Structure 1
Amino acid sequence: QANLMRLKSDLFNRSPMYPGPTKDDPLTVTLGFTLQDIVKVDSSTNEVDLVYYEQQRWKLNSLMWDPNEYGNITDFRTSAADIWTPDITAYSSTRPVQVLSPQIAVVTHDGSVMFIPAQRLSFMCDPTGVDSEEGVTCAVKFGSWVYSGFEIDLKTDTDQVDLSSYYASSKYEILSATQTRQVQHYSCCPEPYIDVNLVVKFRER
């Protein structure tokens, strides 16, 4: 109603979308995972399928506003397609990621954004030993597809994957689930590169 339509029009229709960060205008994206289920293991290929929620946070100056100028609105939800979003990608997927939820973000007056898509991912993982009591460990790296450490700084709030809503009747059982931020340099090149490594140790129930 009323002021919310005005706010959204002012923000998105005075043209032009944000063109992404630079070395000069760098950005911090905070990542976090809620693992819901290990759906499927395939030992013939080496694929393991996961259903998680991916929490992403960033803040843009161009998304700022004065709640006093817009009927005291401090936040609103909007479709993720209305806004620039980070290109944080799983580096070793084996099939196109599948979206399981609506794609809607929250924007707050200080220009902060939170976006939480549910997803099913297939990625590279040898499940050999999933039948034992020790189970098996698998890892998948997430990071920007195009931006270096100088342009997107990737971050987490905890190294602990949220498991409080893992499916209690899953074929598979979680031993540990970890999310850890890594920084590396390559011999050739001065700029840093960053990823968050999702490591899951698990077994048959």
Structure 2
Amino acid sequence: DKLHSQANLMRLKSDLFNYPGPTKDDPLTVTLGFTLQDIVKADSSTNEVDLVYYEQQRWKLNSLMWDPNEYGNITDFRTSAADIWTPDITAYSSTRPVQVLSPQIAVVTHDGSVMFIPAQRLSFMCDPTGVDSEEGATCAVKFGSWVYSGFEIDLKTDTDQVDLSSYYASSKYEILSATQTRQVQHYSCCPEPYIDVNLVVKFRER
């Protein structure tokens, strides 16, 4: 019985995993949302600030679809992010390699939906000057696909408000506002427009 549930899952996974990424003819849309945990450090000597957050990522591939009834009513499953394609979303203004704080495992559901929530620590270019005043300091960093134009990967948010509800209450810095906004930008390298979600944080000393 409980073996039957396993047999069906191993079945489903084996049937499935036997994807070249998106293209202009097969475009993929990624929904991004940020949950900001902490502003760990603000370095005025280098103008770098360190964030800890979660990035929620959602997209859909028909190549991931299946009929639950054939697979014993299995709606969804966890799998290693290595077992599937995942999008290349990248901070455009990092000063160091992002460090991954959580297991890389995604949830795949029968309709082809994939949901993935990497927690990360990020050092990025920010000038904290004013962080000790009432107005505080403002910094911004864009997140987007590195190699994929708007014609291939589109970016969406469900809300322009960063989720602050997990922000660390004892942080050295308190958040005044945090917004996540979709943008369309052009770059020297390429004629095609690239999409980003601009994360803007306004913060000050506690």
Higher strand residue share: 2
Identity %: 99
1:38-92 superposed Cα distances (whole Å, 9 cap, x missing partner) = 0011111010000000000000011000101111101001111100000010001
TM-superposed CA distance for 1:131, in Å, is 1.1
Note closer, same or farther for the CA distance 1:119–1:70 as it changes in structure 2 (3 Å cut): same
User: How many Å separate the matches in 2 of 1:47 and 1:120?
Assistant: 13
TM-superposed CA distance for 1:12, in Å, is 1.1
User: How many Å separate the matches in 2 of 1:4 and 1:185?
Assistant: 44
User: How many Å separate the matches in 2 of 1:65 and 1:95?
Assistant: 40
User: How many Å separate the matches in 1 of 2:136 and 2:118?
Assistant: 28
User: How many Å separate the matches in 1 of 2:153 and 2:145?
Assistant: 7
Q: Which runs of 5+ in 1 are unaligned?
A: none
1:130-175 superposed Cα distances (whole Å, 9 cap, x missing partner) = 1111100000000001000000011101000000110011000000
The 5-angstrom pairing of residues 147-186 of structure 1 reads 147-185=148-186
TM-score (norm. length: structure 2):
0.94
4+ residue runs over 4 A deviation: 185-190
Question: 2:14 corresponds to which residue?
Answer: 9
User: How many Å separate the matches in 2 of 1:38 and 1:185?
Assistant: 30
User: How many Å separate the matches in 1 of 2:143 and 2:125?
Assistant: 13
TM-superposed CA distance for 1:128, in Å, is 0.9
RMSD of Structure 2 on Structure 1 (CA) = 1.4
1:80-106 superposed Cα distances (whole Å, 9 cap, x missing partner) = 110000001000100110011111100
User: How many Å separate the matches in 1 of 2:53 and 2:135?
Assistant: 23
TM-score (norm. length: structure 1):
0.95
User: How many Å separate the matches in 1 of 2:188 and 2:98?
Assistant: 32
TM-superposed CA distance for 1:189, in Å, is 6.6
TM-superposed CA distance for 1:186, in Å, is 6.1
Number of matched pairs: 201
User: How many Å separate the matches in 2 of 1:187 and 1:101?
Assistant: 35
Note closer, same or farther for the CA distance 1:171–1:187 as it changes in structure 2 (3 Å cut): closer
Which range is displaced more, 100-109 or 176-185? 176-185
SS in 1 for 2:121: strand
Q: Which runs of 5+ in 2 are unaligned?
A: 1-5
